[PDB]
Scaffold this active site. Structure first.
Site, PDB file in Angstrom:
ATOM      1  CD1 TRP A 136      -1.409   2.692   1.629  1.00 43.96           C
ATOM      2  CD2 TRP A 136      -3.123   1.653   0.648  1.00 43.96           C
ATOM      3  NE1 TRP A 136      -2.485   3.348   1.568  1.00 43.96           N
ATOM      4  CE2 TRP A 136      -3.406   2.815   0.931  1.00 43.96           C
ATOM      5  CE3 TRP A 136      -3.787   0.366   0.209  1.00 43.96           C
ATOM      6  CZ2 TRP A 136      -4.726   3.236   0.429  1.00 43.96           C
ATOM      7  CZ3 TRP A 136      -5.102   1.153  -0.191  1.00 43.96           C
ATOM      8  CH2 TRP A 136      -5.413   2.224  -0.196  1.00 43.96           C
ATOM      9  CD  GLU A 208       3.641  -1.099   2.769  1.00 47.40           C
ATOM     10  OE1 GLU A 208       2.925  -0.531   3.858  1.00 47.40           O
ATOM     11  OE2 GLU A 208       2.792  -1.743   2.182  1.00 47.40           O
ATOM     12  CG  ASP A 241       6.040   3.967   1.613  1.00 44.33           C
ATOM     13  OD1 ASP A 241       5.875   4.567   2.753  1.00 44.33           O
ATOM     14  OD2 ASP A 241       5.002   3.908   0.989  1.00 44.33           O
ATOM     15  CD  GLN A 244       0.797   2.749   8.257  1.00 46.22           C
ATOM     16  OE1 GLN A 244       0.666   1.772   9.058  1.00 46.22           O
ATOM     17  NE2 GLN A 244      -0.128   2.886   7.163  1.00 46.22           N
ATOM     18  CE  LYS A 270      -1.204   6.159   7.024  1.00 39.84           C
ATOM     19  NZ  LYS A 270      -0.272   5.314   5.864  1.00 39.84           N
ATOM     20  NE  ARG A 404      -3.948  -1.462   9.509  1.00 32.97           N
ATOM     21  CZ  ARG A 404      -3.856  -0.384   8.403  1.00 32.97           C
ATOM     22  NH1 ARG A 404      -2.556  -0.416   7.778  1.00 32.97           N
ATOM     23  NH2 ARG A 404      -4.712   0.439   8.410  1.00 32.97           N
TER      24      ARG A 404
END
Ligand SMILES: *Cc1c(COP(=O)(O)O)cnc(C)c1O
Ligand SMILES: [K+]
Ligand code: NA
Length: 431
Positions: A136, A208, A241, A244, A270, A404
């Protein structure tokens, strides 16, 4: 009460629906690890908003700097420099791994991955981008074309040159080599196939450190390094990435630091904005110098904007002096143990994973078959809200519902406990 009829009517008449379903409440205010509805009920924010608020909601430092700059330096022509920008850019150069020297200050994660991808395609002269099957990276063009966890159907062709290899998933392994799960051999297997399809224009690989949307899938030991080597072998860039995972959420300022594998481009968002729209990418002086020669262009309204840059530098300021990256491991282990205890009392909990303060719990019908727990996951999440704990569960095929859990890096020992307590109760009620 949350039942304001005028509210929900307007909300029904004038709100575009963009996925998911809206909470049946009206969040009136927020502080620290809590949001409060119209009745004043305190809700423990166990997702840090949209996995962003690392300093918690409305943190004093941020409240002052934001006001400070809101009235001093706000917006500027995108060709005018200011101290907050050059300071944030310089800071980031300093806190990121050696090799990452120049930064571009933007607004969103999707926007940042876009920036990294455009720069990679330019510098490499190629255009094919490889990502993970359950990744994502955003809702915009390229970020969306490299996103395989959701959103690929009903909206026309993806970007040309889009590929995806399976993500290494130890809990649900599907690649065996000698009776054991060989996720590294699975890497080679994947890339060979990639090579067979490639038109000879592989530009980079976006990844990620821990796939969040994809169910908190942390890349196993040695993977990152291996991956990095796969890219170098093909003259591809490795874009990590950390929207998060970045800014100490996993227990290190940057997850890429854990593996000790620094990428060619690093994108942040984020957690960097701590709740505000600030994002950025960081790359080497070599790539930037090159991208420059090729006339790289990523001109946005808010790029190099005083206010956001200032808040970002502040978020880094406090994260550092308050050693929240450590608070992340301390509180992350408290949360983890608690989850393992709950996993110990309930069978529906098939797996507890993640790192630092980015944990994930997979609900399964039964450990043995690891069969996804249908509805139960949704139910527990439902129950948690009733109990006043804001949770979030993601569901992908061939995989149980994954909660999560990612509270602020500022959560207290008691806030963590409170969360564990409510989760345990919610699970008791869902069964
Ligand atoms: C949240 C997310 C993004 C999307 O960023 P936006 O601010 O929604 O545009 C990008 N990358 C990752 C890994 C994310 O989880
Ligand atoms: K600007
Ligand atoms: Na650096």
């Amino acid at each position: 009460l949350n039942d304001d009829a005028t509210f929900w009517r307007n909300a029904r008449h004038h709100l575009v629906r963009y996925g998911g379903t809206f909470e049946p409440m009206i969040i009136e205010r927020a502080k620290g690890s809590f949001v409060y509805d119209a009745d004043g009920r305190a809700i423990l924010d166990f997702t840090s908003g949209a996995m962003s608020a690392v300093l918690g909601h409305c943190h004093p430092e941020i409240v002052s700097v934001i006001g400070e700059y809101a009235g001093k330096l706000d917006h500027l022509f995108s060709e005018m420099l200011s101290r907050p920008v050059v300071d944030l850019a310089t800071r980031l150069a300093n806190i990121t791994p050696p090799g990452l020297d120049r930064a571009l200050l933007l607004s969103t994660g999707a926007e940042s991955n876009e920036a990294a991808i455009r720069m990679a395609k330019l510098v490499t002269g190629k255009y094919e981008i490889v990502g993970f099957a359950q990744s994502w990276h955003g809702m915009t063009g390229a970020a969306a074309s490299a996103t395989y966890s959701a959103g690929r159907k009903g909206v026309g062709p993806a970007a040309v040159g889009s590929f995806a290899i399976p993500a290494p998933f130890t809990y649900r392994p599907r690649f065996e080599r000698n009776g054991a799960y060989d996720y590294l051999a699975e890497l080679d297997y994947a890339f060979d196939l990639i090579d067979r399809q490639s038109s000879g224009n592989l530009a980079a690989f976006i990844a990620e450190p821990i796939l969040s949307s994809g169910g908190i899938i942390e890349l196993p030991d040695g993977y990152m390094a291996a991956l990095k080597r796969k890219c170098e072998a093909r003259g591809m860039l490795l874009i990590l990435d950390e929207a998060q995972t970045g800014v100490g959420r996993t227990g290190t300022m940057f997850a890429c630091q854990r593996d000790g594998v620094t990428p060619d481009i690093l994108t942040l968002s984020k957690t960097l904005g701590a709740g505000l729209p600030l994002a950025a990418i960081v790359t080497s002086a070599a790539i930037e110098e090159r991208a420059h020669e090729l006339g790289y262009l990523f001109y946005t309204t808010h790029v190099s904007d005083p206010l956001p840059a200032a808040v970002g530098l502040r978020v880094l300021d406090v994260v550092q002096r308050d050693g929240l990256v450590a608070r992340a491991n301390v509180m992350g282990d408290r949360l983890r143990r608690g989850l393992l205890d709950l996993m110990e009392r309930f069978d529906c909990i098939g797996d507890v994973r993640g790192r630092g303060l980015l944990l994930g719990v997979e609900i399964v019908k039964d450990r043995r078959t690891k069969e996804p727990a249908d509805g139960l996951g949704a139910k527990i999440t439902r129950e948690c809200m009733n109990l006043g704990l804001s949770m979030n569960i993601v569901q992908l095929p061939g995989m149980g519902g994954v909660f999560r859990i990612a509270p602020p890096l500022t959560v207290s020992e008691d806030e963590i406990d409170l969360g564990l307590s409510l989760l345990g109760q919610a699970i008791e009620r869902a069964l």
